[PDB]
Amino acid sequence: RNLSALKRHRQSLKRRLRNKAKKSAIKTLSKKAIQLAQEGKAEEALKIMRKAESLIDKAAKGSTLHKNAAARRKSRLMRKVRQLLEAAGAPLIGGGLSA
Amino acid sequence: PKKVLTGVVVSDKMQKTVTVLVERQFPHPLYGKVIKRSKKYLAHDPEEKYKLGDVVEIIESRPISKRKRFRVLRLVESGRMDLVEKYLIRRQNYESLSKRGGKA
Amino acid sequence: PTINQLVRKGREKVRKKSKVPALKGAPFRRGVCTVVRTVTPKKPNSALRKVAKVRLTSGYEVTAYIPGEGHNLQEHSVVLIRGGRVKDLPGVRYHIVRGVYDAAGVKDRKKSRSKYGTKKPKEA
Amino acid sequence: GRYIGPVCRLCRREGVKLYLKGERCYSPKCAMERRPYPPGQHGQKRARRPSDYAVRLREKQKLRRIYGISERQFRNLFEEASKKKGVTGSVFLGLLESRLDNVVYRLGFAVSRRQARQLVRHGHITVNGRRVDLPSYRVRPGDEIAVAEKSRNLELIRQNLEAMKGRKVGPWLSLDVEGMKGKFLRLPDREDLALPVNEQLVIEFYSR
Amino acid sequence: MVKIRLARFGSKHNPHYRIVVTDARRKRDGKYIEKIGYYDPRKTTPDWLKVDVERARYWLSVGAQPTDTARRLLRQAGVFRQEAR
Amino acid sequence: MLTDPIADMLTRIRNATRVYKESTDVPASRFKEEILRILAREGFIKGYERVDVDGKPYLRVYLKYGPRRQGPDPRPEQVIHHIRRISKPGRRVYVGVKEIPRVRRGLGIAILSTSKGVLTDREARKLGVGGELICEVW
RNA sequence: CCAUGUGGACCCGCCCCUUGGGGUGUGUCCAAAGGGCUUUGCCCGCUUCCGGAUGGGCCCGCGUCCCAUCAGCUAGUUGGUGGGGUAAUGGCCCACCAAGGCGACGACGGGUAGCCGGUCUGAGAGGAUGGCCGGCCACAGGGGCACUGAGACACGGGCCCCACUCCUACGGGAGGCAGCAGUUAGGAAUCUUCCGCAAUGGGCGCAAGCCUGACGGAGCGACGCCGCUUGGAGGAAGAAGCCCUUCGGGGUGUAAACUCCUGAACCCGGGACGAAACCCCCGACGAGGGGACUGACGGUACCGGGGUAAUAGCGCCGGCCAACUCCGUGCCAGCAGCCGCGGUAAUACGGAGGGCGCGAGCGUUACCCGGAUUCACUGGGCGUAAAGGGCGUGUAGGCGGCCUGGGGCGUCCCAUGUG
Ligand SMILES: [Mg+2]
Ligand SMILES: [Mg+2]
Ligand SMILES: [Mg+2]
Ligand SMILES: [Mg+2]
Ligand SMILES: [Mg+2]
Ligand SMILES: [Mg+2]
Ligand SMILES: [Mg+2]
Ligand SMILES: [Mg+2]
Ligand SMILES: [Mg+2]
Ligand SMILES: [Mg+2]
Ligand SMILES: [Mg+2]
Ligand SMILES: [Mg+2]
Ligand SMILES: [Mg+2]
Ligand SMILES: [Mg+2]
Ligand SMILES: [Mg+2]
Ligand SMILES: [Mg+2]
Ligand SMILES: [Mg+2]
Ligand SMILES: [Mg+2]
Ligand SMILES: [Mg+2]
Ligand SMILES: [Mg+2]
Ligand SMILES: [Mg+2]
Ligand SMILES: [Mg+2]
Ligand SMILES: [Mg+2]
Ligand SMILES: [Mg+2]
Ligand SMILES: [Mg+2]
Ligand SMILES: [Mg+2]
Ligand SMILES: [Mg+2]
Ligand SMILES: [Mg+2]
Ligand SMILES: [Mg+2]
Ligand SMILES: [Zn+2]
């Protein structure tokens, strides 16, 4: 056995288990943004959107998503919420949204 | 210079897609008479404009589907069935030369 | 033809068939002997030339000429086998190298030697 | 190595004197002088026609022996004149004279070519002021073939450095008798070298 | 990174070195991106070292790192010199 | 059907000569005229005249020969010892300048069609262009 | 986690450009870390941003072996809109809709092989080939899979099954040289468990340094190319012995014997280049300058002195193919690449003498090209020699008359980027 090696797999484990916690937070959180987006609670969805959008960026400073890949998940959400609120009621906050 | 190709459409029968037949001439590697060999390029025509038998240019482009790597540049002439018949004559003839058979 | 005929059809590069099979690529191949016999020759000739059918290490079971006067070949003597056929006897197309493995070098050989696996006899 | 054996018998093999026995080879001794016919059991019997290839070869062998270098590099010297821009017969010789073992034998310092070699092999020779044990040696125009002082007072050097007051060099050459020196003017011509070879016949053996 | 170093082109006991610009991780004697001179360490000639300064002076505005050996061979080429007052 | 305007001419003048016919007549082209002006620039032929055979347009080429030889076959020497065409049709032959060959070690002529027209390897290379390689006289 | 945010990201808006490129307007979100010393400032770092360079993914144009005794293949198959996924386009992957896509200019299947710079052959055109060195690919016992990360879907990292080997207390676990070196196996055949990290290259470090079976060298193998010795100068009308003889005589053959000369090996001594850097003080941390360390080859190469005459071996000798005779043998024994020799005069078999060719190599066997204009572009042919379809029709395709003009696809030309 070669203790230079083993080191980096114990390493792995620990980041996987911080990278799991990171993503599997964002799914959850942003799914509960899509959700509040449906039935027009423009107040609350636009709250959840920004506490999504940041937990994005801080997984972008890191090594979970790339700037390229995190920017992606920002447009997935941001646009798709600006649009579920089409089929309902106008943006109260206008938090993570530019009129 | 994302390559530019002049060929004549020979397939309408698809969605926003179209098949084009581009041909080229050249001395035979060794034997060296001019020969002329051609190939068909599944082009992209979005708004659908160009029809079955048109004379077009194509350019290398951002891949659109599996076998779509060319958008259509412009039209050099319309109505040129002469070859579309010829290309179909070739496509037909495969009915013959089979070891199923060919009837009278 | 015409140019075009060829352009369409073309010139079919000739194919080469090795007048020596058994040696899967090899120049020699060791086998054990099976039959040790002598077969009388072809047509203008007359002798009792000496031969041995030899199982191989390429799978085969080919027959072999014994070059020379004397020999030591019995049914289980290991051998060695090189190219070079025989215009006197048919079905024999490789020889047996004298002197390697349970195969003799010929004694009483001064001249042609290096072929016959016989060394130098000075103090002669 | 080099050929080493009964030299005056090729004085007679190709039927003319090859002055390789050396100072004896101007006698009424050197083998040829007595018995012209070439070697063994038959040498005297009637000689028939030589093949086209016979003659092709004879006149090659002569030039190979006569210059006292073995085949394998008699070749790479031919095939190095082919590869060189000018007449092939005439370049060839041109780089036989530039070899060290016949840079001496024409600069005087020896009796025959086989001898002349020994003096090269054995640390006896100066080349632009240095020691060269290399018969394979490409002597260029302007080179300095002399003798290292240490061997100078040797008889073989000197009885030979003697006689040179009765001869001349070869017009691509200055001999400095006393100073024990020698100078390579230019290459030769086929003008100079009057050998008993016909050289195109040599090349017609290195066509086949 | 981008680097400048030495690459072997002689043989046994007869090294002749080449000055090269090549990507760090690249094999020693491999497809370099630019030959900028030779260096003869057995020094058997009047010209046992050529460089050409003007390229290594593009190539460091570039940001290609030298070796030690190769560094020292450039100072000695003039590569790193300044003038005026 | 009739295929080669060109190769045809050569073969008239070929078969024409080897019979020792004083004159012979060939189907008026523009090509066949400019190839012909060469063949007399370079004395293989005396010269061509435009003549109408049966109110049809034509070229009358007069034939150059050797001089009365002796022997037992007193028949001279076609100044045209061999004439024959290289760019055959469906099998064409385009040479640059590099690729322009010389004929009979300089004793002869190769004929070219070029962007400047009707040319001999000499005139060809002197000019510094090339193209369809046509025939070959000597 | 919070704040500042020069800037950047995303949503929407306009304005240039035009496939996702550049600007700008509001809202929204994100930064960080401290160690060292010549401590009130220098050094290695830190974070967000444009760019340089470097390397790299992905896509297209042409090039890319055979057999038609494989002719029909295709259902994630071809395309569409929505979606997921990636650094990124895309049936890549999923859902849903239209029914396409390909093929005789070889689709499909089967056979074989990594490809190239180049290498061998050859007048050229081609034919043959891709060890070593180098450029790109692909695997790491067989197969699938993801994590970490800028990067792999990772030889000496990870999860699962199978074969194989092994520890076992019969629950279970370990193991992967096609990295150097060696063992075993196989086979006609392929080597040391060497020295050293001095050089050069890489990783890490402010640095001294540390790891370096890359690599630098040594060992072993005539395996290959080249350099070299086995002597040389003199020496008989010509020893002995050995072979032929027409019994006079011919040949090995100036070769040997001795005369003289030189001095591989060996002995003595001296004895490298390859190595000046990083580092240290001066000087500014810069330019420049000064000092110090270090050799695995190696006590090698090479220089001075000393010195002995001092390995020759293979093929062939009827023709092609350089070389001729005696015996022995008698279609026997045997040679042989081709025709062929041998049945009592053998220039062919086995020996001798003599001869030719080569030489630390000479031969034989295997393969590549030439020969072979015997695959024929260069450079072929069909009346009888192998070969005109038993005769027509006509489709694809190949090819085409005279006169002028427009295009410039070919083809020619010049400049240029690449090779
Ligand atoms: Mg990751
Ligand atoms: Mg000495
Ligand atoms: Mg903040
Ligand atoms: Mg952090
Ligand atoms: Mg802290
Ligand atoms: Mg394979
Ligand atoms: Mg040839
Ligand atoms: Mg290949
Ligand atoms: Mg390699
Ligand atoms: Mg294995
Ligand atoms: Mg695997
Ligand atoms: Mg391993
Ligand atoms: Mg280093
Ligand atoms: Mg050796
Ligand atoms: Mg051997
Ligand atoms: Mg040698
Ligand atoms: Mg002697
Ligand atoms: Mg020094
Ligand atoms: Mg003969
Ligand atoms: Mg024999
Ligand atoms: Mg007899
Ligand atoms: Mg015999
Ligand atoms: Mg051929
Ligand atoms: Mg024929
Ligand atoms: Mg017949
Ligand atoms: Mg018939
Ligand atoms: Mg026409
Ligand atoms: Mg016209
Ligand atoms: Mg053009
Ligand atoms: Zn002599």
Curated annotation (Swiss-Prot), chain A:
Bridged cysteine pairs (disulfide): none
Q: Where is the signal peptide?
A: none
Name the UniProt key words of this record, in alphabetical order: Ribonucleoprotein, Ribosomal protein, RNA-binding, rRNA-binding
Pfam families listed in its UniProt record: Ribosomal_S20p
Q: Where is this region: Disordered?
A: 1-25
Query: InterPro entries attached here?
Result: Ribosomal_bS20, Ribosomal_bS20_sf
Q: Which GO terms describe its cellular component?
A: small ribosomal subunit
Record's keyword annotation contains rRNA-binding: yes
Q: Which GO terms describe its molecular function?
A: small ribosomal subunit rRNA binding; structural constituent of ribosome
In the record, biological process GO terms are: translation
What's this chain's function? One of the primary rRNA binding proteins, it binds directly to 16S rRNA where it nucleates assembly of the bottom of the body of the 30S subunit, by binding to several RNA helices of the 16S rRNA.
Sequence similarity: Belongs to the bacterial ribosomal protein bS20 family.
> What is annotated about its quaternary structure and interactions?
Part of the 30S ribosomal subunit.
| UniProt name for this protein | Small ribosomal subunit protein bS20
Which gene is transcribed and translated to give this protein? rpsT
Curated annotation (Swiss-Prot), chain C:
GO cellular component, as recorded: small ribosomal subunit
Origin: domain of life: Bacteria
Keyword NADP applies = no
Q: Where is the composition biased (Basic residues)?
A: 108-119
Q: Which GO terms fall under molecular function for this chain's record?
A: rRNA binding; structural constituent of ribosome; tRNA binding
In residue numbers, the region (Disordered) covers: 105-124
Q: Mind telling me what this protein is named? A: Small ribosomal subunit protein uS12
Q: Please give the organism.
A: Thermus thermophilus (strain ATCC 27634 / DSM 579 / HB8)
Curated annotation (Swiss-Prot), chain E:
Q: Which domain of life is it from?
A: Bacteria
GO biological process entries: translation
InterPro entries cross-referenced by the UniProt entry: Ribosomal_bS16 (IPR000307), Ribosomal_bS16_dom_sf (IPR023803)
Please provide one cellular component term from the Gene Ontology annotations of this protein: small ribosomal subunit
> What GO molecular function annotations does the UniProt record carry, in alphabetical order?
structural constituent of ribosome
Q: Does the keyword Transferase apply?
A: no
Instruction: Write the record's keywords in alphabetical order, separated by commas.
Output: Ribonucleoprotein, Ribosomal protein
Keyword Cell inner membrane recorded = no
Q: How does it assemble?
A: Part of the 30S ribosomal subunit.
**Family named by the database record:** Belongs to the bacterial ribosomal protein bS16 family.
Q: What does this protein do?
A: Binds to the lower part of the body of the 30S subunit, where it stabilizes two of its domains.
What is the protein name given in its UniProt record? Small ribosomal subunit protein bS16
Swiss-Prot record, chain F:
Q: Which GO terms describe its molecular function?
A: rRNA binding; structural constituent of ribosome
- Is rRNA-binding one of the keywords UniProt gives this record? yes
Which superkingdom heads the taxonomic lineage of this protein's source? Bacteria
Q: Which GO terms describe its biological process?
A: translation
For this UniProt record, the keywords arranged alphabetically read as follows: Ribonucleoprotein, Ribosomal protein, RNA-binding, rRNA-binding
Q: How does it assemble?
A: Part of the 30S ribosomal subunit. Contacts proteins S2, S5 and S12.
Cross-referenced PANTHER family: 40S RIBOSOMAL PROTEIN S15A (PTHR11758)
Q: Briefly, what is this protein's role?
A: One of the primary rRNA binding proteins, it binds directly to 16S rRNA where it helps nucleate assembly of the platform of the 30S subunit central domain. The combined cluster of proteins S8, S12 and S17 appears to hold together the shoulder and platform of the 30S subunit.
Q: Give the family this protein belongs to, as stated in its UniProt record.
A: Belongs to the universal ribosomal protein uS8 family.
Protein name per its UniProtKB record: Small ribosomal subunit protein uS8
Organism listed in the record = Thermus thermophilus (strain ATCC 27634 / DSM 579 / HB8)
Lineage per the UniProt record: Bacteria, Thermotogati, Deinococcota, Deinococci, Thermales
